[PDB]
């Protein structure tokens, strides 16, 4: 039967901008029951329930072990899996996906997924595994390869019933171990479009997708074809807060439009009346199409600011996250016999 997309909310500690503005804590949580509340200046609260609720003291270790670990186990079995970080600029999407390599509890989703996969392949002798990685970015409505030779070359999207939506000409890289995956992640990080604003000095100016392909040849002949999409979206932002001008501002209009398209896809999927879903409104929603309503086990990590200054932006993240938990997917094991 169909299963829901799983949603977790992560509230990061205050940033310097928020402390200088003398803002107050407007986010509350009861983690053991997945509860999150948002308080307005008058005191009125809006209550929500999610699959996970992680507060200012939460670690990447906790988040991964609780919600991501089962999904990565599903990819090893032959399922398609997707983890995507969503939220306002500077909320903690890149920190949640990449993290800090030198602090064990602070390592992100992506490096932990590499360790988990290669430990599972190393402890299985009756299945031979081949692991490939790809890494792309959607920058100003152009799909670009972050591991290719021409990072400026616009790539085209193709569709096929047995493959879903894919990127034609996207380079594929064999990874025999965790260092190989890390070398690609480093190379890709250097090529990703980034830029400074008053909301985030290290703002991601594109949506990124790191895909790990897990192919397993079983002793009963058959080939399992698991695939893990690790998605670090760009975030919603406002010119009055970022202070963005020129090219930085042009990126903001394309980022905001593509994120509005994702919101519209989420809303149409759960309104109970939309016969057609607007996946083609952006390259982002076309590449997330199979993850939202399709053949995939999906997790959204909705990141939020704890500050009263970001009440409106945090409320928007929570409303879309609340809607996303009702999206119904039909994941199946991808397994080609002989
Ligand atoms: N939970 C956290 N604990 C400590 N530092 C954090 C946390 N979350 C984020 N940060 C830091 O806060 C800054 C902004 O976070 P970042 O993950 O880059 O935001 P983002 O959601 O990806 N923003 P953007 O790319 O502009 O849409 C970085 O310096 C992070 O390392
Ligand atoms: Mg980021």
Residue numbers in the entry: 1 to 338
What's written in the study?
OSM‐3 belongs to the homodimeric kinesin‐2 subfamily and is the Caenorhabditis elegans homologue of human KIF17. Similar to KIF17, OSM‐3 is involved in intraflagellar transport in the distal part of the cilium, and both proteins are autoinhibited at the resting state. The OSM‐3 motor domain shows the typical kinesin fold, with a central eight‐stranded β‐sheet surrounded by 3 α‐helices on either side.
OSM‐3 was incubated with apyrase in the presence of this stable ATP analog and crystals diffracting X‐rays up to 1.9 Å were obtained. The structure was solved by molecular replacement using ADP‐OSM‐3 as a search model, with two very similar molecules in the asymmetric unit (rmsd 0.50 Å; 335 Cαs compared). In particular, the Switch 2‐L11‐α4 region is fully ordered, with a short helical segment formed in L11 and α4 extended at its N‐terminal region by about 2.5 turns compared to ADP‐OSM‐3. Therefore, the nucleotide‐binding site of AMPPNP‐OSM‐3 is in a ‘closed’ conformation. Much of this is due to a ~ 15° rotation of α4 and to a ~ 2 Å translation of α5, two helices involved in the interaction with microtubules. In particular, two water molecules in the OSM‐3 nucleotide‐binding site overlap with W1 and W2 of Eg5. The residues that are within hydrogen bond distance to these water molecules belong to the Switch 1 (Ser204 (carbonyl oxygen) and Arg205 in OSM‐3) and Switch 2 (Gly235 and Glu237) motifs. Further comparisons indicate that, similar to isolated kinesin‐4 and kinesin‐5, AMPPNP‐OSM‐3 adopts the structure of tubulin‐bound or microtubule‐bound ATP‐like kinesin‐1, kinesin‐6, kinesin‐8, and kinesin‐13, suggesting that AMPPNP‐OSM‐3 displays the microtubule‐bound ATP conformation of OSM‐3.
